[PDB]
């Protein structure tokens, strides 16, 4: 029998912020299969179960009577939705797992799609169905020049990419750029998401740099920063690859699934190359009859692909619930109205429902639903956080949380700060 969240329960949650997070890490595009072929999604989508809440829930379930088998979360992956072919992910003893065998056939007429993650515990108690960000179906990558008109295939400076290498048309040889143990390596099992930043040509080397806006073009100076570790490679010039060559005179916009070359800016034709698991510096041999072409190593060719991440955070504030936790509301940003009648806060995001309430700390706010991507609420008086405060004395920072009618808490990682 469902229950509303109480200030005591809210207070208790805020004491130990034990949330259960689901991350779906994937590519923004996908190449389609045809004649019974299975052109697997590369890089493989990855489901990570993050947060202190997973252990807290394993503990809760096991004390109630569940075995380790029963308390173990289960995940299944698929596309939205086909004829229900869902692959089991194995997270047994792992905080994450990759979807190594996913593909999309010509039979699917959808121009776009989302991955769906069905989740439940061993005992079959539901968690819910988590959606990836929008994925664009692609016939194959553009062999000739690209236009900014279809920017859905272009690479915007400041967005994230995956970079992989494959030898002799073999799925077995697939190694991905990735940082672990303080180093950049080429993993056959993990993959990194690197921000690709555009720098002006005049820009100097070093730890600090100025990023520029716009679409990435061959010949431009880029900077690749791992979105987890925070490590970068030295300045690189992204270059087109014809076959075993690197074209210098090319200045076309860099597109999805194209083969690239990373010339280490200010070096004697040195490129970012792979040798087994190692990331090295390999020197290109220049073409005898062409000043605009350099022969590069087979491990110096990298397929570039735009990546995205879906993040869902929930907590059983009033204990286990009947209804799934999904669709988990996501808050993109907060804004004041301001600055009109009374202080209003505007929430921009997705998966908002009429049955959600905004909370500032342990204080519930008058909440007004607008649509699934917009919500309005009234900022409570400062006196609701500090007894008898006739005005805001000194700054107070309070968490903004979305709470559901049945007790589920969805934290935002956003706060509201009162100032005089």
């Amino acid at each position: 029998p469902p229950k509303r969240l109480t200030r005591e329960a809210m207070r208790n949650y805020l004491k130990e912020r034990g949330d259960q997070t689901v991350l779906i890490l994937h590519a923004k595009v996908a190449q389609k299969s045809y004649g019974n072929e299975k052109r697997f999604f590369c890089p493989p989508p990855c489901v990570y179960l993050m947060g202190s809440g997973w252990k807290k829930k394993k503990e809760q379930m096991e004390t109630d009577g569940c075995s380790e088998q029963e308390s173990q979360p289960c995940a299944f992956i698929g596309i939205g939705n086909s004829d229900q072919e869902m692959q089991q992910l194995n997270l047994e003893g792992k905080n994450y797992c990759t979807a190594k065998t996913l593909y999309i056939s010509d039979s699917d007429k959808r121009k776009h799609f989302m991955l769906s993650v069905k989740m439940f515990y061993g005992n079959s108690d539901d968690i819910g169905v988590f959606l990836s960000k929008r994925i664009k179906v692609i016939s194959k990558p553009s062999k000739k020049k690209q236009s900014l008109k279809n920017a859905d295939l272009c690479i915007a400076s400041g967005t994230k990419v995956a970079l992989f290498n494959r030898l002799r048309s073999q799925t077995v040889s697939t190694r991905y750029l990735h940082v672990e143990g303080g180093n950049f390596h080429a993993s056959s099992q993990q993959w990194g998401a690197f921000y690709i930043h555009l720098l002006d040509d005049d820009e100097s080397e070093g730890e600090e740099f100025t990023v520029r806006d716009g679409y990435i073009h061959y010949g431009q100076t880029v900077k690749l920063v791992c979105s987890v570790t925070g490590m970068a490679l030295p300045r690189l010039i992204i270059r087109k690859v014809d076959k075993q060559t690197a074209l210098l005179d090319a200045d076309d916009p860099v597109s999805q699934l194209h083969k690239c070359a990373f010339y280490l800016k200010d070096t004697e034709r040195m490129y970012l190359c792979l040798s087994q698991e190692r990331i090295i510096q390999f020197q290109a041999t220049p073409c005898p009859k062409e000043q605009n072409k350099e022969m590069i190593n087979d491990g110096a060719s990298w397929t570039i692909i735009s990546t995205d991440k879906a993040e869902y955070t929930f907590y059983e504030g009033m204990g286990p619930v009947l209804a799934p936790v999904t669709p988990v509301p996501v808050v993109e940003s907060l804004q004041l109205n301001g600055g009109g009648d009374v202080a209003m806060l505007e929430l921009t995001g997705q998966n908002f429902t009429p049955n959600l309430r905004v909370w500032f700390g342990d204080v519930e706010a008058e909440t007004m639903y607008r649509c699934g991507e917009s919500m309005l609420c009234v900022v409570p008086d400062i006196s609701a956080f500090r007894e008898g405060w006739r005005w805001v004395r000194q700054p107070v920072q309070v968490p903004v949380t979305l709470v559901r009618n049945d007790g589920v808490i969805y934290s935002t990682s956003l706060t509201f700060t009162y100032t005089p």
Binding site: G158, V179, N183, F184, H197, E205, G206, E207, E208, F209, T210, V211, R212, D213, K223, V225, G230, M231, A232, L233, P234, L264, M270, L272, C273, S275, I279, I280, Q281
Partner: peptide, 15 residues
């Protein structure tokens, strides 16, 4: 638009 602070991992040569 914007500044980024990211330590540089130098890829090495061989021999």
């Amino acid at each position: 638009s914007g500044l980024v602070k990211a330590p540089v991992w130098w890829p090495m040569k061989d021999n």
